[PDB]
Design an enzyme around this catalytic site. Sequence first.
Site, PDB file in Angstrom:
ATOM      1  N   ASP A  16      38.411  42.567  39.337  1.00 32.20           N
ATOM      2  CA  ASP A  16      38.033  41.323  39.993  1.00 32.20           C
ATOM      3  C   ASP A  16      37.993  41.459  41.509  1.00 32.20           C
ATOM      4  O   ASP A  16      37.587  40.527  42.210  1.00 32.20           O
ATOM      5  CB  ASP A  16      38.994  40.216  39.538  1.00 32.20           C
ATOM      6  CG  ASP A  16      40.404  40.335  40.076  1.00 32.20           C
ATOM      7  OD1 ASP A  16      40.720  41.208  40.910  1.00 32.20           O
ATOM      8  OD2 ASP A  16      41.276  39.529  39.682  1.00 32.20           O
ATOM      9  N   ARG A  30      37.131  38.823  46.397  1.00 31.45           N
ATOM     10  CA  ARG A  30      37.517  38.425  45.058  1.00 31.45           C
ATOM     11  C   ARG A  30      36.258  37.921  44.366  1.00 31.45           C
ATOM     12  O   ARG A  30      35.526  37.114  44.945  1.00 31.45           O
ATOM     13  CB  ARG A  30      38.617  37.369  45.146  1.00 31.45           C
ATOM     14  CG  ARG A  30      38.892  36.662  43.819  1.00 31.45           C
ATOM     15  CD  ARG A  30      39.820  37.522  42.995  1.00 31.45           C
ATOM     16  NE  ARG A  30      40.382  36.919  41.810  1.00 31.45           N
ATOM     17  CZ  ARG A  30      39.758  36.588  40.692  1.00 31.45           C
ATOM     18  NH1 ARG A  30      38.452  36.790  40.568  1.00 31.45           N
ATOM     19  NH2 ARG A  30      40.454  36.046  39.696  1.00 31.45           N
ATOM     20  N   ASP A  35      37.859  35.711  35.612  1.00 27.10           N
ATOM     21  CA  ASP A  35      39.186  36.295  35.552  1.00 27.10           C
ATOM     22  C   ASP A  35      39.200  37.468  34.585  1.00 27.10           C
ATOM     23  O   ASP A  35      39.006  37.289  33.385  1.00 27.10           O
ATOM     24  CB  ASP A  35      40.239  35.269  35.122  1.00 27.10           C
ATOM     25  CG  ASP A  35      40.159  34.046  36.021  1.00 27.10           C
ATOM     26  OD1 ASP A  35      40.229  34.216  37.256  1.00 27.10           O
ATOM     27  OD2 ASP A  35      40.012  32.930  35.486  1.00 27.10           O
ATOM     28  N   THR A  36      39.430  38.645  35.147  1.00 22.53           N
ATOM     29  CA  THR A  36      39.494  39.871  34.374  1.00 22.53           C
ATOM     30  C   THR A  36      40.944  40.189  34.055  1.00 22.53           C
ATOM     31  O   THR A  36      41.817  39.766  34.812  1.00 22.53           O
ATOM     32  CB  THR A  36      38.910  41.065  35.147  1.00 22.53           C
ATOM     33  OG1 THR A  36      39.731  41.272  36.302  1.00 22.53           O
ATOM     34  CG2 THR A  36      37.517  40.749  35.650  1.00 22.53           C
ATOM     35  N   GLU A  38      44.209  42.332  34.315  1.00 19.21           N
ATOM     36  CA  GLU A  38      44.503  43.061  35.548  1.00 19.21           C
ATOM     37  C   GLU A  38      45.303  44.337  35.333  1.00 19.21           C
ATOM     38  O   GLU A  38      46.037  44.454  34.359  1.00 19.21           O
ATOM     39  CB  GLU A  38      45.284  42.170  36.521  1.00 19.21           C
ATOM     40  CG  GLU A  38      44.388  41.280  37.367  1.00 19.21           C
ATOM     41  CD  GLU A  38      45.195  40.337  38.242  1.00 19.21           C
ATOM     42  OE1 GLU A  38      46.060  40.824  38.999  1.00 19.21           O
ATOM     43  OE2 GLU A  38      44.955  39.115  38.158  1.00 19.21           O
ATOM     44  N   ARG A  82      40.947  36.822  51.218  1.00 17.76           N
ATOM     45  CA  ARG A  82      39.866  37.436  50.459  1.00 17.76           C
ATOM     46  C   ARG A  82      38.563  36.663  50.504  1.00 17.76           C
ATOM     47  O   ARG A  82      38.485  35.443  50.325  1.00 17.76           O
ATOM     48  CB  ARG A  82      40.349  37.580  49.007  1.00 17.76           C
ATOM     49  CG  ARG A  82      41.583  38.485  48.941  1.00 17.76           C
ATOM     50  CD  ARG A  82      41.834  38.856  47.482  1.00 17.76           C
ATOM     51  NE  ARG A  82      42.286  37.675  46.747  1.00 17.76           N
ATOM     52  CZ  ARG A  82      42.518  37.580  45.451  1.00 17.76           C
ATOM     53  NH1 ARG A  82      42.360  38.583  44.600  1.00 17.76           N
ATOM     54  NH2 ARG A  82      42.928  36.406  44.986  1.00 17.76           N
TER      55      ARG A  82
END
Length: 136
Positions: A16, A30, A35-36, A38, A82
């Site tokens: 991500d 970002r 949402d990956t 992690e 980010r």
Amino acid sequence: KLHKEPATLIKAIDGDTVKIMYKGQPMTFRLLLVDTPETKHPKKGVEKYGPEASAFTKKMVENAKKIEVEFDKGQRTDKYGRGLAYIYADGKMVNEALVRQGLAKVAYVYKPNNTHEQHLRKSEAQAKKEKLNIWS
């Protein structure tokens, strides 16, 4: 009207998150709306499909001729500094590619940063129906 701007890959960090040279300044970015799993999850660590989401983003950004970033209409950085954005690797949106492959879920969305939300939700339904990775 969103538009894309050129950028240069510095380094991929997670599924991500990628470090990019943007208007001559190194920056962490970002990926907007996804949402990956992690590998650098602050709480649980290296979740399932974390390494996979991670190598995919890496390969994708790494093998590209052209990286571009596209900001949405809302805030452009998060509270961690980010950049918030859609990333394109040779014309293909990395955020959508992740969701279509079942290596990311559409993230809880914050207007007005939600311009490609529907599109992505569409790619998520398909990876779900095809039961890929996350959805298997």
